[PDB]
Coordinates of C-alpha atoms and ligand atoms in Angstrom, one line a residue:
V1 CA -23.2 -26.4 -234.0
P2 CA -21.9 -28.6 -237.0
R3 CA -24.7 -30.8 -238.6
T4 CA -22.4 -33.9 -237.9
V5 CA -22.9 -33.9 -234.2
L6 CA -25.7 -36.1 -232.6
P7 CA -28.8 -34.8 -231.6
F8 CA -29.8 -33.9 -227.9
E9 CA -32.4 -36.4 -228.2
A10 CA -29.6 -39.3 -228.9
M11 CA -27.7 -38.6 -225.4
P12 CA -28.1 -41.9 -223.2
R13 CA -30.9 -41.2 -220.7
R14 CA -31.1 -42.3 -217.0
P15 CA -34.2 -44.5 -216.9
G16 CA -36.7 -42.3 -214.7
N17 CA -39.3 -45.5 -214.2
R18 CA -37.4 -48.5 -213.5
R19 CA -38.6 -50.9 -210.7
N20 CA -36.3 -51.1 -208.1
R21 CA -36.0 -49.9 -204.5
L22 CA -34.7 -46.4 -205.2
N23 CA -38.3 -44.9 -204.0
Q24 CA -37.4 -46.7 -200.5
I25 CA -33.8 -45.6 -200.7
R26 CA -35.1 -42.1 -200.9
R27 CA -37.6 -42.4 -198.2
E28 CA -34.7 -43.9 -195.9
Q29 CA -31.4 -42.1 -196.7
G30 CA -32.5 -39.1 -199.5
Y31 CA -29.6 -38.3 -201.8
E32 CA -26.8 -39.5 -199.6
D33 CA -25.3 -42.0 -201.9
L34 CA -26.0 -39.8 -204.8
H35 CA -22.3 -39.8 -205.8
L36 CA -22.4 -43.5 -206.2
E37 CA -25.9 -43.6 -208.2
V38 CA -24.3 -41.2 -210.8
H39 CA -21.1 -43.3 -210.9
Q40 CA -23.0 -46.5 -211.4
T41 CA -24.9 -44.7 -214.1
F42 CA -21.9 -43.7 -215.8
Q43 CA -20.4 -46.8 -215.8
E44 CA -23.5 -48.3 -217.8
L45 CA -24.0 -45.6 -219.9
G46 CA -20.7 -43.9 -220.8
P47 CA -19.3 -40.5 -219.7
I48 CA -22.2 -38.3 -221.0
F49 CA -26.0 -39.0 -219.7
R50 CA -29.5 -37.1 -219.2
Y51 CA -30.8 -37.3 -215.7
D52 CA -34.6 -37.3 -216.4
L53 CA -36.5 -35.9 -213.4
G54 CA -39.7 -33.9 -213.1
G55 CA -39.8 -33.2 -217.0
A56 CA -36.4 -31.8 -216.8
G57 CA -33.2 -33.6 -218.0
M58 CA -29.5 -32.2 -216.4
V59 CA -26.7 -33.3 -218.4
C60 CA -24.0 -35.1 -216.4
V61 CA -20.6 -35.0 -217.5
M62 CA -16.9 -36.6 -216.0
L63 CA -14.2 -35.8 -218.5
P64 CA -11.5 -33.1 -218.6
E65 CA -12.3 -32.6 -222.3
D66 CA -16.0 -31.5 -221.1
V67 CA -14.7 -28.9 -218.7
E68 CA -12.3 -27.6 -221.1
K69 CA -15.5 -27.0 -223.4
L70 CA -17.6 -25.4 -220.6
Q71 CA -14.7 -23.0 -220.0
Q72 CA -14.8 -21.9 -223.5
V73 CA -18.7 -20.8 -222.8
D74 CA -18.5 -19.1 -219.8
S75 CA -19.8 -15.6 -220.3
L76 CA -18.0 -12.6 -219.1
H77 CA -19.9 -13.5 -215.6
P78 CA -20.8 -17.1 -215.5
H79 CA -24.5 -17.7 -213.9
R80 CA -24.6 -18.9 -210.8
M81 CA -28.1 -20.6 -209.1
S82 CA -27.5 -18.4 -205.7
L83 CA -27.9 -19.7 -202.2
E84 CA -31.3 -18.7 -201.4
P85 CA -30.9 -18.8 -197.4
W86 CA -27.8 -16.5 -197.7
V87 CA -29.7 -14.2 -200.2
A88 CA -32.7 -13.9 -198.1
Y89 CA -30.7 -12.9 -195.0
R90 CA -29.1 -10.1 -197.1
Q91 CA -32.3 -9.1 -198.2
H92 CA -34.2 -8.9 -194.8
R93 CA -31.2 -7.1 -192.9
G94 CA -30.2 -4.8 -195.9
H95 CA -26.7 -6.0 -196.2
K96 CA -25.1 -6.5 -199.7
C97 CA -24.6 -10.0 -201.4
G98 CA -21.0 -10.7 -202.3
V99 CA -19.3 -12.7 -205.2
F100 CA -20.8 -16.0 -204.0
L101 CA -24.1 -14.9 -204.4
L102 CA -24.1 -11.9 -207.1
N103 CA -24.5 -12.6 -210.7
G104 CA -24.1 -10.2 -213.7
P105 CA -21.8 -7.2 -214.0
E106 CA -22.2 -6.6 -210.5
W107 CA -20.3 -10.0 -209.7
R108 CA -17.6 -9.2 -212.4
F109 CA -16.9 -5.9 -210.7
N110 CA -16.8 -7.3 -207.3
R111 CA -14.7 -10.5 -208.5
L112 CA -12.0 -8.2 -210.6
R113 CA -11.3 -6.2 -207.4
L114 CA -11.1 -9.3 -205.0
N115 CA -9.0 -11.5 -207.1
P116 CA -5.6 -9.3 -206.4
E117 CA -5.9 -9.5 -202.7
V118 CA -7.0 -13.3 -202.5
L119 CA -6.0 -15.4 -205.4
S120 CA -3.1 -13.7 -207.0
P121 CA 0.7 -14.8 -206.5
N122 CA 1.3 -11.8 -204.7
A123 CA -1.8 -12.3 -202.4
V124 CA -0.3 -15.6 -201.6
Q125 CA 3.2 -14.4 -200.9
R126 CA 1.6 -11.8 -198.5
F127 CA -0.6 -14.3 -196.5
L128 CA 1.7 -17.4 -196.3
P129 CA 3.6 -16.2 -193.2
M130 CA 0.2 -15.8 -191.2
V131 CA -1.0 -19.3 -192.4
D132 CA 2.2 -20.7 -191.5
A133 CA 2.2 -19.0 -187.9
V134 CA -1.2 -20.5 -187.2
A135 CA 0.1 -24.1 -188.7
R136 CA 3.2 -24.0 -186.3
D137 CA 0.6 -23.2 -183.2
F138 CA -1.4 -26.2 -184.1
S139 CA 1.7 -28.7 -184.8
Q140 CA 3.1 -27.6 -181.8
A141 CA 0.1 -28.3 -179.6
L142 CA -0.4 -31.6 -181.2
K143 CA 3.4 -32.7 -180.5
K144 CA 2.8 -31.4 -176.8
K145 CA -0.1 -33.7 -176.1
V146 CA 1.9 -36.3 -177.9
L147 CA 5.0 -35.9 -175.7
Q148 CA 3.0 -35.6 -172.3
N149 CA 0.8 -38.7 -172.8
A150 CA 1.6 -41.7 -170.3
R151 CA 1.6 -44.2 -173.4
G152 CA 4.1 -42.4 -175.8
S153 CA 1.2 -42.0 -178.4
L154 CA -2.0 -40.2 -178.7
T155 CA -5.3 -41.7 -180.2
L156 CA -7.8 -38.7 -180.6
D157 CA -10.6 -37.4 -182.8
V158 CA -8.8 -34.7 -185.0
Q159 CA -11.8 -33.5 -186.8
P160 CA -12.7 -30.7 -184.3
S161 CA -9.0 -29.7 -184.1
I162 CA -8.2 -29.4 -187.8
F163 CA -11.8 -27.6 -188.3
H164 CA -10.7 -24.9 -185.8
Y165 CA -7.4 -24.6 -187.5
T166 CA -8.9 -23.7 -190.8
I167 CA -11.1 -21.1 -189.2
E168 CA -8.2 -19.5 -187.2
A169 CA -6.0 -19.4 -190.1
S170 CA -8.4 -18.1 -192.5
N171 CA -9.7 -15.4 -190.1
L172 CA -6.0 -14.3 -189.4
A173 CA -5.3 -14.2 -193.3
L174 CA -9.0 -12.2 -193.8
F175 CA -9.2 -9.7 -190.7
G176 CA -5.7 -9.9 -189.2
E177 CA -7.0 -11.6 -185.8
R178 CA -6.4 -14.5 -184.0
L179 CA -9.6 -16.1 -182.6
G180 CA -7.4 -17.8 -179.9
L181 CA -9.3 -21.4 -181.0
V182 CA -5.4 -23.4 -180.5
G183 CA -5.7 -22.4 -176.6
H184 CA -7.8 -24.8 -174.1
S185 CA -10.0 -21.9 -173.0
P186 CA -10.5 -19.5 -176.0
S187 CA -12.7 -16.3 -175.3
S188 CA -16.8 -16.6 -175.2
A189 CA -16.8 -14.0 -178.1
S190 CA -14.5 -16.6 -180.4
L191 CA -16.4 -19.6 -179.5
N192 CA -19.8 -17.4 -180.2
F193 CA -18.6 -16.8 -183.6
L194 CA -17.2 -20.1 -184.3
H195 CA -20.7 -21.7 -182.9
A196 CA -22.5 -19.2 -185.5
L197 CA -20.3 -20.3 -188.4
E198 CA -21.4 -24.1 -187.6
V199 CA -25.0 -23.2 -187.0
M200 CA -25.4 -20.9 -190.4
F201 CA -23.8 -23.9 -192.5
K202 CA -26.2 -26.6 -190.5
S203 CA -29.4 -24.5 -191.1
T204 CA -28.2 -23.7 -194.8
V205 CA -28.7 -27.5 -195.7
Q206 CA -31.8 -28.0 -193.3
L207 CA -33.3 -25.1 -195.5
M208 CA -32.1 -26.2 -198.9
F209 CA -33.8 -29.8 -198.1
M210 CA -37.0 -28.2 -196.5
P211 CA -39.9 -29.9 -198.2
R212 CA -42.4 -27.5 -199.8
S213 CA -45.5 -28.9 -197.8
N214 CA -43.6 -28.1 -194.5
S215 CA -42.0 -25.2 -194.8
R216 CA -44.9 -22.6 -193.5
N217 CA -44.5 -24.0 -190.2
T218 CA -41.2 -26.5 -189.6
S219 CA -38.9 -23.5 -191.5
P220 CA -39.7 -20.4 -189.1
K221 CA -37.5 -21.7 -186.3
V222 CA -35.0 -23.0 -189.0
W223 CA -35.0 -19.4 -190.6
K224 CA -34.4 -17.6 -187.2
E225 CA -31.5 -19.9 -186.2
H226 CA -29.9 -19.1 -189.9
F227 CA -30.6 -15.2 -189.9
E228 CA -29.4 -15.0 -185.9
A229 CA -26.2 -16.9 -186.9
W230 CA -25.5 -14.9 -189.9
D231 CA -26.5 -11.5 -187.3
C232 CA -23.6 -13.0 -185.2
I233 CA -21.2 -13.4 -188.4
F234 CA -21.9 -10.0 -189.2
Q235 CA -21.6 -8.8 -186.1
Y236 CA -17.7 -10.0 -186.0
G237 CA -17.2 -8.7 -189.0
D238 CA -18.3 -5.2 -188.6
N239 CA -16.5 -5.1 -185.3
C240 CA -12.9 -6.3 -187.3
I241 CA -13.7 -3.7 -189.9
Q242 CA -14.0 -1.1 -187.5
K243 CA -10.8 -2.0 -185.8
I244 CA -9.2 -2.0 -189.0
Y245 CA -10.7 1.4 -190.0
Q246 CA -9.1 2.8 -186.7
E247 CA -5.6 1.2 -187.3
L248 CA -5.7 2.6 -191.2
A249 CA -6.7 6.0 -189.7
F250 CA -4.4 6.8 -187.1
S251 CA -1.6 4.2 -187.0
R252 CA -1.4 2.9 -190.3
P253 CA 1.7 0.5 -191.1
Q254 CA 3.9 0.3 -194.1
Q255 CA 3.3 -3.3 -194.3
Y256 CA 0.6 -5.9 -195.5
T257 CA -1.5 -7.0 -192.3
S258 CA -4.9 -8.5 -193.7
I259 CA -6.9 -9.3 -197.0
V260 CA -9.5 -6.9 -195.5
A261 CA -7.0 -4.2 -194.8
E262 CA -5.7 -4.1 -198.4
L263 CA -9.4 -4.1 -199.9
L264 CA -10.1 -1.0 -197.6
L265 CA -6.9 0.9 -198.7
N266 CA -7.6 0.1 -202.3
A267 CA -11.3 1.5 -201.8
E268 CA -12.3 0.0 -205.1
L269 CA -15.5 -1.5 -203.7
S270 CA -17.6 0.2 -201.1
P271 CA -17.4 -0.6 -197.2
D272 CA -20.8 -2.6 -197.6
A273 CA -19.4 -4.7 -200.5
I274 CA -16.2 -5.3 -198.7
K275 CA -18.2 -6.6 -195.4
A276 CA -20.4 -8.9 -197.8
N277 CA -17.2 -10.2 -199.5
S278 CA -15.5 -10.9 -196.5
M279 CA -18.2 -12.4 -194.7
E280 CA -18.5 -14.8 -197.8
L281 CA -14.9 -15.4 -197.8
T282 CA -15.5 -16.4 -194.1
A283 CA -18.3 -18.6 -194.4
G284 CA -16.1 -20.2 -197.3
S285 CA -14.0 -22.1 -194.7
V286 CA -17.0 -23.9 -192.9
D287 CA -17.2 -27.8 -194.0
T288 CA -14.6 -27.3 -196.6
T289 CA -10.7 -27.4 -196.2
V290 CA -11.4 -29.7 -193.2
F291 CA -12.4 -32.5 -195.3
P292 CA -9.4 -33.0 -197.4
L293 CA -6.8 -32.1 -194.9
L294 CA -8.5 -35.0 -192.8
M295 CA -8.6 -37.5 -195.9
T296 CA -5.0 -36.6 -196.4
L297 CA -4.2 -37.6 -192.7
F298 CA -6.3 -40.6 -193.4
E299 CA -4.6 -41.8 -196.6
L300 CA -1.2 -41.2 -195.3
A301 CA -1.7 -43.4 -192.2
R302 CA -2.9 -46.1 -194.8
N303 CA 0.0 -45.4 -197.1
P304 CA 3.3 -45.5 -195.0
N305 CA 5.7 -45.5 -197.9
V306 CA 3.8 -42.3 -199.3
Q307 CA 3.8 -40.6 -195.6
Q308 CA 7.5 -41.2 -195.5
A309 CA 8.4 -40.1 -198.6
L310 CA 6.5 -36.6 -197.8
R311 CA 8.2 -36.6 -194.6
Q312 CA 11.6 -36.7 -196.5
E313 CA 10.6 -34.2 -198.7
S314 CA 9.5 -31.6 -195.8
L315 CA 12.5 -32.3 -193.8
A316 CA 14.8 -31.5 -196.8
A317 CA 12.9 -28.6 -197.2
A318 CA 12.5 -27.4 -193.3
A319 CA 15.3 -24.9 -193.1
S320 CA 14.2 -23.2 -196.2
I321 CA 10.7 -23.1 -195.3
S322 CA 11.3 -21.7 -191.8
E323 CA 13.6 -19.1 -193.0
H324 CA 10.9 -17.9 -196.0
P325 CA 7.3 -19.9 -195.6
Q326 CA 6.7 -18.4 -199.1
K327 CA 9.1 -21.5 -200.2
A328 CA 6.4 -23.9 -199.0
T329 CA 5.0 -23.0 -202.9
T330 CA 7.8 -24.6 -204.9
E331 CA 9.8 -26.7 -202.2
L332 CA 7.1 -29.2 -201.5
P333 CA 6.2 -30.7 -205.1
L334 CA 5.3 -34.1 -203.7
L335 CA 3.2 -32.8 -200.5
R336 CA 1.3 -30.5 -203.6
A337 CA 0.5 -33.5 -205.5
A338 CA -0.7 -35.5 -202.3
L339 CA -3.2 -32.7 -202.0
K340 CA -4.3 -33.2 -205.9
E341 CA -4.6 -36.8 -205.1
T342 CA -6.8 -36.7 -202.0
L343 CA -9.3 -34.3 -204.0
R344 CA -9.0 -36.6 -206.6
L345 CA -10.7 -39.4 -204.7
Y346 CA -12.3 -36.8 -202.3
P347 CA -14.1 -33.9 -203.6
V348 CA -15.8 -31.7 -201.3
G349 CA -18.1 -30.2 -203.7
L350 CA -19.8 -33.0 -205.6
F351 CA -20.2 -31.4 -209.1
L352 CA -19.4 -28.3 -210.9
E353 CA -22.4 -26.5 -212.2
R354 CA -23.1 -24.4 -215.3
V355 CA -26.1 -23.4 -217.6
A356 CA -25.1 -23.3 -221.0
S357 CA -24.9 -19.5 -221.8
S358 CA -25.0 -20.8 -225.6
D359 CA -25.9 -24.0 -227.4
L360 CA -22.6 -26.0 -227.4
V361 CA -21.2 -29.6 -228.1
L362 CA -20.3 -32.0 -225.4
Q363 CA -19.0 -35.5 -226.4
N364 CA -20.5 -34.8 -229.9
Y365 CA -23.8 -34.3 -228.7
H366 CA -25.6 -31.3 -229.4
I367 CA -26.3 -29.2 -226.0
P368 CA -29.4 -26.8 -226.3
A369 CA -28.8 -23.4 -224.7
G370 CA -30.3 -23.2 -220.8
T371 CA -29.6 -26.9 -220.5
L372 CA -27.9 -27.6 -216.9
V373 CA -24.7 -29.1 -217.1
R374 CA -23.0 -30.8 -214.2
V375 CA -19.5 -32.3 -214.2
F376 CA -19.3 -34.9 -211.4
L377 CA -16.0 -34.9 -209.5
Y378 CA -16.4 -38.0 -208.0
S379 CA -16.6 -39.9 -211.3
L380 CA -13.8 -37.6 -213.0
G381 CA -11.3 -38.8 -210.6
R382 CA -12.1 -42.5 -210.6
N383 CA -11.8 -42.8 -214.5
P384 CA -9.2 -45.6 -215.3
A385 CA -8.5 -44.2 -218.6
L386 CA -7.1 -41.2 -217.3
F387 CA -6.2 -42.5 -213.5
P388 CA -4.7 -45.9 -214.0
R389 CA -5.1 -47.9 -210.8
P390 CA -7.6 -45.4 -209.5
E391 CA -8.2 -46.9 -206.1
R392 CA -4.5 -46.3 -205.5
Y393 CA -3.2 -43.2 -203.5
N394 CA -0.2 -42.0 -205.5
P395 CA 1.0 -38.5 -205.6
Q396 CA 3.6 -39.3 -208.0
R397 CA 1.1 -39.5 -210.5
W398 CA 0.7 -35.7 -210.6
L399 CA 4.4 -35.5 -211.0
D400 CA 4.0 -37.8 -214.1
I401 CA 0.6 -36.5 -215.6
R402 CA 0.3 -36.7 -219.1
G403 CA -2.7 -36.3 -221.4
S404 CA -3.8 -33.4 -224.0
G405 CA -6.2 -31.9 -221.4
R406 CA -3.9 -32.2 -218.6
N407 CA -4.9 -28.9 -217.2
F408 CA -8.5 -30.2 -216.6
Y409 CA -7.6 -33.3 -214.5
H410 CA -7.5 -31.4 -211.3
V411 CA -10.8 -29.1 -211.2
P412 CA -11.8 -29.5 -207.6
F413 CA -12.0 -25.6 -207.2
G414 CA -13.9 -25.6 -210.7
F415 CA -12.6 -23.4 -213.6
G416 CA -12.3 -20.0 -215.1
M417 CA -13.2 -16.7 -214.0
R418 CA -15.9 -17.9 -211.4
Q419 CA -13.5 -20.6 -209.8
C420 CA -12.9 -20.9 -206.3
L421 CA -12.0 -17.6 -204.8
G422 CA -10.6 -19.3 -201.2
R423 CA -8.5 -22.0 -203.7
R424 CA -5.1 -20.6 -202.7
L425 CA -5.9 -19.6 -199.0
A426 CA -7.4 -23.5 -198.6
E427 CA -4.3 -24.7 -200.5
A428 CA -1.8 -23.0 -198.5
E429 CA -3.7 -24.0 -195.1
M430 CA -3.4 -27.8 -196.0
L431 CA -0.1 -27.7 -197.2
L432 CA 1.6 -25.7 -194.0
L433 CA -0.3 -27.9 -191.7
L434 CA 0.8 -31.0 -193.4
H435 CA 4.5 -29.9 -193.7
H436 CA 4.8 -28.9 -189.9
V437 CA 2.8 -32.3 -188.5
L438 CA 5.0 -34.8 -190.7
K439 CA 8.3 -33.1 -189.6
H440 CA 7.6 -34.2 -186.1
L441 CA 4.9 -36.8 -186.1
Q442 CA 3.7 -40.2 -187.8
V443 CA 0.0 -41.1 -188.3
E444 CA -1.8 -44.2 -187.9
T445 CA -5.4 -45.6 -188.0
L446 CA -6.7 -48.9 -186.4
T447 CA -8.2 -50.4 -189.6
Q448 CA -7.5 -49.7 -193.2
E449 CA -11.3 -49.9 -194.1
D450 CA -12.6 -47.4 -196.8
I451 CA -14.2 -44.5 -195.3
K452 CA -17.9 -44.0 -196.5
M453 CA -18.7 -40.3 -197.8
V454 CA -22.2 -39.1 -197.4
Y455 CA -23.8 -36.4 -199.7
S456 CA -25.4 -33.6 -197.6
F457 CA -24.6 -30.3 -199.9
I458 CA -21.0 -31.6 -199.6
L459 CA -19.4 -34.8 -199.7
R460 CA -18.4 -35.7 -195.9
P461 CA -17.1 -38.5 -194.2
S462 CA -19.9 -40.6 -192.3
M463 CA -17.7 -42.1 -189.3
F464 CA -14.1 -40.5 -189.7
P465 CA -12.0 -43.0 -187.3
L466 CA -9.4 -41.9 -184.6
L467 CA -5.9 -41.2 -185.5
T468 CA -2.8 -42.2 -183.6
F469 CA 0.3 -39.9 -183.6
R470 CA 3.6 -40.8 -182.4
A471 CA 6.9 -38.8 -182.3
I472 CA 9.4 -39.8 -185.4
Ligands
HEM1 C1 -10.7 -27.5 -200.4 C2 -11.7 -26.6 -200.1 C3 -12.4 -26.1 -201.1 C4 -13.0 -26.4 -202.6 C5 -12.8 -27.8 -202.7 C6 -13.7 -25.4 -202.6 C7 -14.4 -25.6 -204.3 C8 -15.3 -24.5 -204.6 C9 -15.8 -24.7 -206.0 C10 -16.0 -26.0 -206.7 C11 -16.2 -23.7 -206.2 C12 -17.2 -23.2 -207.5 C13 -16.5 -22.8 -208.6 C14 -16.7 -23.3 -210.2 O1 -18.1 -23.5 -210.2 O2 -15.9 -23.0 -211.2 C15 -16.0 -22.7 -205.3 C16 -16.4 -21.2 -205.0 C17 -16.3 -20.3 -204.1 N1 -15.3 -21.0 -202.9 FE1 -14.5 -22.5 -202.6 N2 -13.5 -24.3 -202.2 C18 -12.9 -24.8 -200.8 C19 -12.8 -23.7 -200.2 C20 -12.9 -22.6 -200.1 C21 -12.3 -21.7 -199.1 C22 -11.4 -21.9 -197.9 C23 -12.8 -20.2 -199.3 C24 -12.8 -19.3 -198.6 C25 -11.6 -18.7 -197.8 C26 -13.7 -20.6 -200.4 C27 -14.5 -19.5 -201.1 C28 -15.1 -19.8 -202.7 C29 -16.1 -18.6 -202.9 C30 -16.1 -17.1 -202.3 C31 -16.7 -19.2 -203.9 C32 -17.4 -18.4 -205.1 C33 -16.7 -17.8 -206.1 C34 -17.6 -17.1 -206.9 O3 -18.8 -17.6 -207.3 O4 -17.3 -15.8 -207.4 N3 -13.5 -21.7 -201.1 N4 -15.5 -23.5 -204.3
CHD2 C1 -43.1 -19.2 -198.6 C2 -42.9 -20.0 -197.3 C3 -44.3 -20.5 -196.9 C4 -45.5 -19.4 -197.1 C5 -47.0 -20.1 -196.8 O1 -47.4 -21.1 -197.1 O2 -47.4 -19.1 -195.9 C6 -42.4 -19.1 -196.2 C7 -42.2 -19.6 -194.5 C8 -41.1 -19.1 -194.2 C9 -40.9 -17.9 -194.9 C10 -39.4 -17.4 -194.7 C11 -39.5 -16.6 -192.9 O3 -40.4 -16.0 -192.8 C12 -38.1 -15.9 -193.2 C13 -38.2 -14.6 -194.1 C14 -38.6 -13.7 -193.6 C15 -38.7 -12.4 -194.5 O4 -39.4 -11.5 -194.1 C16 -39.0 -12.8 -196.0 C17 -38.2 -14.0 -196.7 C18 -38.0 -15.1 -195.8 C19 -36.9 -16.2 -195.8 C20 -39.6 -15.8 -195.7 C21 -39.8 -16.4 -197.0 C22 -41.0 -17.1 -197.3 O5 -42.1 -16.2 -196.8 C23 -41.1 -18.4 -196.3 C24 -40.0 -19.6 -196.9
CHD3 C1 -30.2 -34.9 -208.0 C2 -31.1 -34.6 -207.2 C3 -32.4 -35.7 -207.3 C4 -32.2 -37.0 -207.9 C5 -33.5 -37.7 -208.0 O1 -34.5 -37.5 -207.5 O2 -33.4 -38.9 -208.7 C6 -31.6 -33.4 -206.5 C7 -33.1 -33.3 -205.4 C8 -32.4 -32.2 -204.6 C9 -31.2 -31.2 -205.0 C10 -30.4 -30.4 -204.3 C11 -31.1 -29.5 -203.7 O3 -31.9 -28.5 -204.6 C12 -30.3 -28.4 -202.6 C13 -29.3 -27.7 -203.4 C14 -29.7 -26.7 -204.5 C15 -28.1 -26.4 -204.8 O4 -28.4 -25.4 -205.9 C16 -27.6 -27.5 -205.7 C17 -27.0 -28.4 -204.7 C18 -28.4 -29.1 -204.1 C19 -27.5 -30.1 -202.8 C20 -29.4 -30.1 -205.0 C21 -28.6 -30.8 -205.7 C22 -29.4 -31.9 -206.7 O5 -29.8 -31.2 -207.9 C23 -30.5 -32.6 -205.6 C24 -29.9 -33.5 -204.8
MYT4 C1 -18.1 -27.1 -201.4 C2 -18.7 -25.6 -201.9 C3 -20.1 -25.8 -201.4 C4 -18.6 -25.9 -203.5 O1 -18.3 -26.8 -204.0 C5 -19.2 -24.7 -204.3 C6 -19.9 -23.7 -203.7 C7 -20.3 -22.5 -204.8 C8 -20.7 -22.8 -206.1 N1 -20.4 -24.1 -206.6 C9 -19.8 -25.3 -205.9 C10 -18.0 -24.6 -201.5 C11 -18.7 -23.6 -200.4 C12 -17.8 -22.7 -200.0 C13 -16.5 -22.3 -200.4 N2 -16.3 -23.1 -201.6 C14 -16.7 -24.2 -202.3

């Protein structure tokens, strides 16, 4: 690094030895306010600091310029601190690890053979009609509940139905199957699969935060629950892959039907590798897309001028998107901007993480090779220097957006070759559900109070309010 950069020792340090009630806050609520605690530290120390704990020091950053510098020192296979409970399940049952868990050349081999079928513009053009079909079914089911309510309006908890929508849409894109989670009586097999997804994620978070001194005897029931949930998920995956094998051998269609069928036809990855990646993509919808979809509905309820501008756009584009759902990618610029605005205020992952593959420089400080660097998305999005009136929900800011490093202003899906593999499937699900709902319905909430987010592996709303829908 240049001789003019400040030494690592000069970086502002978060005091580890202050007298305050953090000790007691940890006893009572653990790390549930970590986003706010780190945000306060950036306010005090500036946009880079060393978080000292247990003899170690994580570098905390929050600027687009830092994300750009990290993308520069990404290797051909950026290192990931693999989710241990998920790895342990694969080790125990003799399943492969997929891109969520792999490192090194094996990660890259897998990733390059998935990108064209999941992340590419061509992949999106193929799956958009399937996501559109599920979005229509969800939107029609809600409109029907509204129009049959005695009170001319429907106040409901939308959290379960929006979650079910994301699983239904993703599972259709991946395996070409409808679980039926829009019906009032979905099959026991579909509900068992959904339950297993929920238990898998809940048990992941319980195991990651299991104290060392309690693992021997508190963890075995949780490990059992985790592995039994994964067994159910892998049974569903095997069932779908066997069905696809049968279709491709004896009844092969000319047209695209599913991401997994395309991977099996390509035959670049082994069947066991395709299953592992399909199960990780399956898991990728659990407790992710639901949150920005909910928070977009919440902010549209609070910002009726923005809601009406999005409704005008969706009504003007409605005919074009009905003819070719693929048009949703270019004909709803303000709604795409609204998704960026939701994720600016309400990231799902709290941070992006890299281990410095080489010495580098961030904010004119020398960063030694091997340093843990975390980009805190909550703080990046609330920087008033880059996002004037950062508390304001203003999708127009993205159509206006200026500044040198503007490519790195929107990074809630990460960056570079190890960015979120599911990002375009997540984006399409959010875009099309909101498009179809806004054409038919208006949303409100009783109070305009900010939602409290809690950090529990992901950032999630504490007490998401009932929403009220009415016909337009
Ligand atoms: C709004 C919803 C979501 C957000 C904000 C999100 C965000 C992220 C982020 C930040 C990463 C790490 C990227 C990096 O370090 O550069 C990631 C990885 C990943 N995400 Fe997502 N994600 C979401 C939804 C999904 C969905 C729906 C799927 C699957 C259908 C998915 C599949 C994955 C996979 C497989 C990886 C690992 C990629 C790899 O390591 O090669 N994600 N996501
Ligand atoms: C290391 C810890 C406690 C060890 C002890 O003090 O006895 C034990 C408790 C539960 C154990 C895990 C559970 O038995 C579930 C898994 C069982 C597999 O046979 C090994 C990995 C596996 C993931 C185990 C790893 C490790 O041995 C754990 C985590
Ligand atoms: C930063 C914080 C410690 C802060 C403090 O004691 O002041 C630590 C303690 C436990 C850590 C978490 C746990 O190790 C569980 C998770 C492990 C994953 O690899 C990253 C996220 C993950 C959710 C961790 C994030 C973060 O490093 C946590 C929350
Ligand atoms: C939200 C979460 C946990 C995420 O931000 C993440 C996942 C892997 C690595 N880094 C961040 C995630 C989880 C599943 C799919 N995509 C994203």
